[PDB]
Symmetry: D2
Subunit: 212 residues, 4 copies
Amino acid sequence: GAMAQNITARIGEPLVLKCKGAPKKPPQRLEWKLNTGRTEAWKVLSPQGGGPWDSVARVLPNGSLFLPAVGIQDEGIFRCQAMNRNGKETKSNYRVRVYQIPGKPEIVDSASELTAGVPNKVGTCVSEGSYPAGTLSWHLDGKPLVPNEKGVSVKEQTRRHPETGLFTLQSELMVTPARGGDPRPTFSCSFSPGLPRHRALRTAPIQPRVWE
Amino acid sequence: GAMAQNITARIGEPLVLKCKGAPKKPPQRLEWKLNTGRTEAWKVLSPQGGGPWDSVARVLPNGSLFLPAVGIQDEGIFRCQAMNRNGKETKSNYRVRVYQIPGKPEIVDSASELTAGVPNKVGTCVSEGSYPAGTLSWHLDGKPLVPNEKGVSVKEQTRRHPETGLFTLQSELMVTPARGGDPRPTFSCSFSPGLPRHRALRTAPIQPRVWE
Amino acid sequence: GAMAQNITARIGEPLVLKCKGAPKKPPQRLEWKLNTGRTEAWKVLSPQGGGPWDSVARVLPNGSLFLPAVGIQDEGIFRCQAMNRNGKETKSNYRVRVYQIPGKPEIVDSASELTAGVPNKVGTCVSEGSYPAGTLSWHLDGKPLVPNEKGVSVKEQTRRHPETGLFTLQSELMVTPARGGDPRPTFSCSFSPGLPRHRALRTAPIQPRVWE
Amino acid sequence: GAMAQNITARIGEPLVLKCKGAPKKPPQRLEWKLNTGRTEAWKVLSPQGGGPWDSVARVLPNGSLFLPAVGIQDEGIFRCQAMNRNGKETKSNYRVRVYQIPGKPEIVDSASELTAGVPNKVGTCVSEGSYPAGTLSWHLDGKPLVPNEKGVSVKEQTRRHPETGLFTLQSELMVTPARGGDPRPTFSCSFSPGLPRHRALRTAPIQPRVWE
Ligand SMILES: O=C(O)c1ccc(Oc2cccc(COCc3cccc(-c4c(C(=O)O)[nH]c5ccccc45)c3)c2)cc1
Ligand SMILES: O=C(O)c1ccc(Oc2cccc(COCc3cccc(-c4c(C(=O)O)[nH]c5ccccc45)c3)c2)cc1
Ligand SMILES: O=C(O)c1ccc(Oc2cccc(COCc3cccc(-c4c(C(=O)O)[nH]c5ccccc45)c3)c2)cc1
Ligand SMILES: O=C(O)c1ccc(Oc2cccc(COCc3cccc(-c4c(C(=O)O)[nH]c5ccccc45)c3)c2)cc1
Ligand SMILES: [Cl-]
Ligand SMILES: [Cl-]
Ligand SMILES: [Cl-]
Ligand SMILES: [Cl-]
């Protein structure tokens, strides 16, 4: 595509996109074009508006585009072209990526006892309500646990909510504790969002006892 | 995929899918699995049900799967596996395709006069509310008009309704009437649905005058 | 999207798309833009060309766009904008749909004997190498057989070739012949292409004997 | 879906997937099922093999599935079900995600001089050949530069190679240096891969002079 400003828009929240170079109030020679999950290729939106799109995305008096409650299908590309009073044309190009933050992750079915030297089910981490899916990972006394690297194995599952489309992730951790290791290790799980610079969420720790 | 019974389901209407081989009433050893636009790969549904899926697809007392109002995202694959009283297992496999019938097509902006030997805009045919999109085509005195043959040109547009996802099609017809041809030709447009054996819908005819 | 000329392009064959309004030979102020399965949104192509796109789609001396061998990923939208010597701008807008014709369909595993009044497997129809998938249907002495309508049942399967992406369809027909019906009925299967105005392909007939 | 082992497979490299529980050498009662970009829903593969799938994914003597050179279309789900000599059934479930590492990112068109208190184009960062796309980000003397905070603006572009499908990313950085700040700042750009635990790649730094 072309060079664009990246926009991250939280699902359910409003979004205002500026039409650069447009006069401050009507009359305005401007046009918006959008290609999103709602459209077949480009759809043109005008200041006069009208029709079913008025419920979804409307041009404001200052020429900006307004979406009262972003959904997953609004992901896509949004462009404006405007002429100012002098006649200079100005383009605006946005790439809109949508997201939702899940609830704090939880560990369910955690083991209270582990036996050293054999595989043990440690627990299952669950995160509900993300978009995009994101990922879950495990930590042992503050360091990342890497699957298939040192007696660690992980299985993962993804589900979607049938109406909202948001993701539920589950991750089951198994470990073989090394003989002579720490008798009260501390495990946690973290949710890492898909989009850049979004913060991780962490579970409360679990601390089983390890039998030599 | 595997061999399946093809199911066509109209958007907004209920759908009942039989679980072959299941006992007539509970208790029943059966399981449904579905992979549709709502799911991440296979989702399992059980007679006990529960959760947000109960609003979308529920197992009935006789083991059939019930969807009270099909939508576009229910397109996909639906399977049941059941054991009867004797313990014989029976599989059911369905491929569900969704559709909606548009309103009767209309001709807008029709020409009242055509000039023979030059290109003329005849009209624009519009169909609103189909799924899958389907196609529009033109006819002249009962015979198909083929684009790019014998002085015929057509341009087409597709749009989607931003909330329902249903398609609006437009088709603009241009013709160059042959000199010495019929002075009062009859044009019509037809909507052809995407799915097999669904009937076409036809516009009222238009009858311009042709000037030699 | 916008109004476009519909283009149907056979997979593996070249495609030339005209840039309306461009000068006949260089120098030319024109630009092509395409959004297809190969692109992230719009890709711009220029008369000078260069790079990996030269292998796929190149501007010719007369300003037309040339694809030496269309593939499935070239489905999409192709646009040109040109200025003539006078400075008039002209736009060209194409919607390109790709297709391939399968081999003639065949009936395999046909029954030689049918018993009236009970269900019988009649045969399996197979079509290899279509795009888009298309559909198979059955006929009995020249009339369409409708699934689930009169002791007729059909099961269907779709597969894709792992390298070419082309579709193989299979359709298994079962019938319960009516008592006192024709002792030597004639069944056939037809392949119906997905795109408009493309011709159907038909199998050779089978003529089992029916036992009263 | 169901619980699965996550597999990350580099494009162009072989992949071997174990069929847990299968006998060590033929004869073996096992079956693989896969649903990937190459398939229409589930495709079954058997030890005997045959056909065009042998070029893509083949069962080995020990029952493992072998792909000699993974591509983007092999992303998906791979499952085995086997019986051992005793008759115990074992399932294996894999979710295969594909990737490619781009070349080291580069800064092009870097500014040698910046003026404090006004916006300045700093440079354009380019990364070629990733899958999934990944993202680019900028740093100033070792700290992340956040777009739209403290006089920082970024624009981004994504393109795909027309034959390989791999992504090229570009990111253009603009900054307004604060008056009285460091006269010789150090900027760099980093590529962050899409998949978890893959390492970032960093450009060589640039050090323009800032004029008060
Ligand atoms: O006299 C009057 O009453 C009157 C006159 C004009 C008018 O409205 C316009 C005023 C200026 C220009 C345009 C024409 O611009 C369309 C457009 C609208 C969105 C985006 C783009 C666009 C395109 C592209 O589509 O080519 N590429 C891009 C790349 C990056 C960013 C944007 C684009 C173009 C329309 C209204 C009323
Ligand atoms: O004791 C109890 O209380 C109790 C016992 C069992 C039970 O429920 C089942 C009763 C019989 C068998 C199965 C196990 O079948 C799962 C399945 C469910 C849907 C579809 C399929 C399926 C698969 C596949 O997934 O392999 N392939 C197919 C191809 C074509 C058609 C269907 C399939 C399999 C579950 C409930 C309660
Ligand atoms: O001086 C020189 O050396 C020199 C000058 C110009 C030049 O090349 C051009 C000559 C005329 C106009 C344009 C600018 O047009 C871009 C474009 C290219 C494809 C398609 C479209 C397009 C858009 C849209 O993108 O807005 N919408 C559409 C709707 C329907 C059909 C097409 C479009 C626009 C570029 C080369 C050299
Ligand atoms: O006598 C002989 O010569 C002979 C006998 C059997 C034979 O091969 C099989 C040996 C055991 C079982 C099965 C039947 O299993 C199919 C299957 C194959 C892949 C995956 C799955 C599967 C399903 C599912 O599809 O239901 N769900 C899952 C969830 C997680 C993991 C896997 C699955 C099922 C086939 C070959 C030869
Ligand atoms: Cl799901
Ligand atoms: Cl639209
Ligand atoms: Cl397949
Ligand atoms: Cl691109």
